[PDB]
Amino acid sequence: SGAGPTSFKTMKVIDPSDKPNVLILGSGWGAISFLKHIDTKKYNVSIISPRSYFLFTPLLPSAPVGTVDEKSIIEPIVNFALKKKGNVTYYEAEATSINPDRNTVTIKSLSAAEIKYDYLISAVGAEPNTFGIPGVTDYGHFLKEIPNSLEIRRTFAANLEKANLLPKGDPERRRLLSIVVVGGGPTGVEAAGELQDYVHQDLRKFLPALAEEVQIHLVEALPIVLNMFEKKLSSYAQSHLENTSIKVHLRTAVAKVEEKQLLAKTKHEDGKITEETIPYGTLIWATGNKARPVITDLFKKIPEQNSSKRGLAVNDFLQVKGSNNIFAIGDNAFAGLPPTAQVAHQEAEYLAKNFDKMAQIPNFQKKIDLLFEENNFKPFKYNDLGALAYLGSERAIATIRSGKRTFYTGGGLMTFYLWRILYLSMILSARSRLKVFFDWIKLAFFKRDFFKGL
Amino acid sequence: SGAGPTSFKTMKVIDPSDKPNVLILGSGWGAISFLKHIDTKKYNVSIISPRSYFLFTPLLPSAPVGTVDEKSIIEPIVNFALKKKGNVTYYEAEATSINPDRNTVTIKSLSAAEIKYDYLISAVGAEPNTFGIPGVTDYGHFLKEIPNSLEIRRTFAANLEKANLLPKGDPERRRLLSIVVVGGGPTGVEAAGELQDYVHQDLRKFLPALAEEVQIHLVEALPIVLNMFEKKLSSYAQSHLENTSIKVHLRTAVAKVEEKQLLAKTKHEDGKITEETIPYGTLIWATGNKARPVITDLFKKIPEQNSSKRGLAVNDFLQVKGSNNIFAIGDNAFAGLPPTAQVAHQEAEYLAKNFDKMAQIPNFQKKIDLLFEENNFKPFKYNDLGALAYLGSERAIATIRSGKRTFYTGGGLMTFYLWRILYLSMILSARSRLKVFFDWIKLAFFKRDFFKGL
Ligand SMILES: Cc1cc2nc3c(=O)[nH]c(=O)nc-3n(C[C@H](O)[C@H](O)[C@H](O)COP(=O)(O)OP(=O)(O)OC[C@H]3O[C@@H](n4cnc5c(N)ncnc54)[C@H](O)[C@@H]3O)c2cc1C
Ligand SMILES: Cc1cc2nc3c(=O)[nH]c(=O)nc-3n(C[C@H](O)[C@H](O)[C@H](O)COP(=O)(O)OP(=O)(O)OC[C@H]3O[C@@H](n4cnc5c(N)ncnc54)[C@H](O)[C@@H]3O)c2cc1C
Ligand SMILES: C/C=C(C)/C=C\C=C/[C@H](OC)[C@@H](C)[C@@H](OC)[C@@H](C)CCc1oc2c(O)c(OC)cc(OC)c2c(=O)c1C
Ligand SMILES: C/C=C(C)/C=C\C=C/[C@H](OC)[C@@H](C)[C@@H](OC)[C@@H](C)CCc1oc2c(O)c(OC)cc(OC)c2c(=O)c1C
Ligand SMILES: C\C=C(C)/C=C/C=C\[C@H](OC)[C@@H](C)[C@@H](OC)[C@@H](C)CCc1oc2c(O)c(OC)cc(OC)c2c(=O)c1C
Ligand SMILES: C\C=C(C)/C=C/C=C\[C@H](OC)[C@@H](C)[C@@H](OC)[C@@H](C)CCc1oc2c(O)c(OC)cc(OC)c2c(=O)c1C
Ligand SMILES: [Mg+2]
Ligand SMILES: [Mg+2]
Ligand SMILES: [Mg+2]
Ligand SMILES: [Mg+2]
Ligand SMILES: [Mg+2]
Ligand SMILES: [Mg+2]
Ligand SMILES: [Mg+2]
Ligand SMILES: [Mg+2]
């Protein structure tokens, strides 16, 4: 086919086939968690993704400022594939059309056909949502993929360089040193906190006059940040952010983004609506999920998905409603659950175990959930294990749970240490775990590397 | 001035001046070793260099394949500057003309004036010499600066990708997997060895068919590799290189480099001259020093330098012959010594100590060596401490000495461990030392990162 140059087929065995062809879309939390658990001797497993590596997304906000290095939080797909007992095929390409009628996926490669399947596992994720707000794509940076980390560093480094040539009182200097982060979830909060850490811990030590003039803004439409946590943790988080000099704009929406300024509209608690023009040098847009084009295209082809908006509606067995043989997990699937890596991972593990049982029942190996129900398959039940968020300045919040029971809840320095330990344990490869560990040790003794060219 | 955006002046004290203006050209072994030892309270110290960081050159051959990371072997100049007690000025620019008549250096910035001096310390180094051989600059890669490391990785990665799409017996596949390294000194030998390590230790584990078809060529005009070592070590080195499958072409000169092949001419020991067309995919040109344009320009302006070729001829006090106030150290200076980091470092330390004594004698602070001779300054005496070279496959050679006495001489696994320990001790910053240490630990457990995009 016309797939990219990082494409492969592993060769653990000599392929004759009798086995169903299982095609996975994506190389992220859902796809790779599924790959880790799927039996590649029961099924012929293929993967379509434009990205030849897994990204440990929870540490992406640490990468732009060099708290961790970009290499440390990625792992090539081939390394996961080579742990499998059977053969794995990877096509470096993006799915452009899912064709349920003829059981194929049309692919195109950026760096260059229809790929057949018996079962499809869609895990392409979601893209950042700009909500049609003008100027976001022209002037803002997303914080979603490794290239975004590099772009943010290049932008902020260039702004610091330009600001440094202007006199202390110049409003252009002040503007160039202004950062606006939109989104009060973990990504935006952690982006803000990591930037504030860089500025106050490292930049201050060699460019103190620049550092003291940096202003970080966090903008969020809801009345609180981190609304997945209990109220006292959200309040603690906001108070801490404010204590580190981050200006938090709650109940605030960005109406437009222009080149050198953006318009923020606040609906205050008293009901008044005010507008503020916020000059900015660096805009990070860290909010909103929306369905990718290949997914919104699929909505039109399955009657039961015609009303879908956020993602593919899936049943208790993670089948795409209206399809006998397409499953969806993670951010591209709507199952009434939050768009988190935790959800993607559990969905993937559940689904892989279902595929083990499916190989024992002849009807699967030759009312869409009839066979699942007749054979007494348990429905998927998400177990919320809690939530973590780094807040800058060696503070984190954490709620740790399982079922109705909460084991731990709190914030402070101890919680930051817990945050680090838990994140290390959740990294999917030993290589990436060691690299992140070393990044953090180096950080205890030395400043971060903040190089525009590396 | 019109210097680049990484330019700075440190502000340890409030500058009034009475002190001579000492201007350093470069940010490499000579310049940074000199900076480390120069008293910035006795002198107003400025630096002109287009590169805002120090490069630990002895580990550059390890960088293309990810034995070490590029970040690990560099250190920003500002970090050395901030260790000094006085103020240090850095201009991100290249010296384009040294103007001895008016005691200035003309600068231009790549990323944009005449800078005055009382004393000039030239340490701009030398550039790779192609010897006018056609095609070297069109098709070859130097191995001199960080961007070259990135370029070599991009080229070899792209070649492996292309070769992987061709059938096992295709001569284009074989060509794309052919590497030619020109130069049998430490740089070329280590480049070859590091590439052979990557191919046989890492690539082989996931692309064995590609790996087994890679051919590395080492081409050298002299009858032996590593001619700075004793004969038995050179012979051991060649034998080891050959034992790892590197084809060593001694007594061989490259007559021309074309796009897909180069012509190698061998004068055999029996006197016959043969030609071989060597197909290649990656060419690394790791031989020959030549004077940079700013230096060859200076030859014409000082009568005593009119006959100079290799570099500025310097006297026993490292003064440029024909100048009262220009000194030169490292590869841009000819003192009858080899172009090595060891020589540059000793020259720099010697010269900085001379500047300490110069500040005590009024004639320096307001026959070019008359004042040095009258005041009984000791001439510079190079102390050869030995030589080290990595050979791939966990083997190194080492000769360790001081004066007439040799403490150690040998090759093998133990010498490789010694090579690592010695290299770590010679890195100029604790940050870089820790990063290299961590790179090597990670390598003991995991494959190298060989990413075209990072
Ligand atoms: C910066 C950041 C920090 C986060 N932190 C946390 C956290 O701390 N905790 C938490 O629970 N969640 C976190 N999340 C959310 C979590 O990353 C997502 O919920 C998770 O990525 C969902 O997994 P997924 O497999 O659906 O999507 P992803 O992991 O995004 O993977 C999607 C994959 O599909 C590929 N792809 C895209 N288009 C196509 C196409 N057309 N065809 C084929 N493949 C395609 C992509 O390249 C990618 O490999 C974070 C997200 C971000 C962006
Ligand atoms: C890959 C490699 C491996 C090596 N390994 C070893 C080894 O193991 N042992 C050993 O003893 N030696 C080694 N060397 C040799 C050693 O690096 C040189 O002898 C040493 O660099 C000389 O120091 P220098 O200060 O003269 O030049 P450099 O260290 O090359 O520094 C020159 C500086 O001048 C700057 N510059 C260039 N043009 C201008 C301009 N117009 N104006 C101002 N600044 C300019 C450059 O950016 C650079 O900062 C190696 C060299 C290479 C390339
Ligand atoms: C009786 C107990 C049962 C039945 C199961 C687990 C019990 C204890 C666990 O720890 C031992 C659990 C408390 C601890 O870790 C799971 C939680 C902090 C997990 C919280 C947690 O997890 C994630 C996770 O697991 C992922 O997987 C790859 C991915 C994730 O995206 C970042 C997360 C995640 O963001 C969070 C917050
Ligand atoms: C009586 C002893 C005296 C008076 C002085 C030193 C004695 C022992 C030393 O080790 C303790 C010495 C043996 C040991 O290290 C210096 C040698 C292996 C050094 C060999 C050595 O050195 C370099 C060096 O030093 C540099 O400096 C920055 C830079 C260098 O470029 C890479 C080198 C270098 O390439 C080599 C080979
Ligand atoms: C007597 C017997 C033994 C084995 C003694 C071991 C002593 C230290 C260990 O190293 C060897 C070390 C690994 C261990 O203890 C600090 C941590 C995992 C504990 C948790 C811990 O603490 C931190 C810490 O304390 C810091 O302090 C300045 C800084 C830190 O980051 C900013 C951390 C940290 O991020 C974590 C996770
Ligand atoms: C009983 C009391 C103590 C303190 C015991 C300490 C044991 C190990 C140390 O780690 C804690 C370790 C740092 C130390 O010993 C291996 C090295 C510096 C010794 C020199 C050494 O050896 C290597 C080695 O042996 C390897 O083997 C598979 C691999 C190696 O690279 C490829 C090296 C190596 O590159 C070096 C420099
Ligand atoms: Mg995925
Ligand atoms: Mg992702
Ligand atoms: Mg998904
Ligand atoms: Mg996603
Ligand atoms: Mg230098
Ligand atoms: Mg250099
Ligand atoms: Mg020099
Ligand atoms: Mg040089």
Numbering used by the authors:
A (entry chain A), B (entry chain A): 33 to 48, 51 to 146, 165 to 418, 426 to 513
Could you share sentences copied from the article?
A monotopic alternative NADH dehydrogenase (Type II NADH dehydrogenase: NDH-2) catalyses the electron transfer from NADH to quinone via FAD or FMN without a proton-pumping activity, and functions as an initial enzyme, either in addition to or as an alternative to proton-pumping NADH dehydrogenase (complex I) in the respiratory chain of bacteria, archaea, and fungal and plant mitochondria. A series of studies has suggested that Ndi1, one of three NDH-2s from Saccharomyces cerevisiae, would be useful in replacement therapy for mitochondrial diseases caused by complex I dysfunction. We reported that the enzymatic reaction of yeast Ndi1 has a ping-pong mechanism, as is the case with NDH-2s from Mycobacterium tuberculosis and Yarrowia lipolytica. In this reaction mechanism, two substrates—NADH and ubiquinone—bind to the enzyme sequentially, but not at the same time.
A Lineweaver-Burk plot analyses indicated that stigmatellin is a competitive inhibitor whereas the others are mixed-type. The crystal of Ndi1-stigmatellin contains one Ndi1 and two bound stigmatellin molecules in the asymmetric unit. Two stigmatellin molecules, STG-1 and STG-2 are bound to the hydrophobic surface of the membrane-anchor region of Ndi1. STG-1 is located at the si-face of the adjacent FAD cofactor in the cavity formed by the C-terminal α15 helix and the β19-21 sheets of Ndi1. The aromatic head groups of the STG-1a and STG-1b overlap each other, while the aliphatic tails extend to different directions. The aromatic head groups of the STG-1a and STG-1b form hydrogen bonds with the isoalloxazine ring of the FAD cofactor and are surrounded by W63, P92, A393, Q394, H397, A446, L447, Y482, M485, and L487 (site 1 in Figs 4A and 5). In contrast, STG-2 is bound to a groove formed by helixes α15 and α16 in the C terminal membrane-anchor domain of Ndi1.
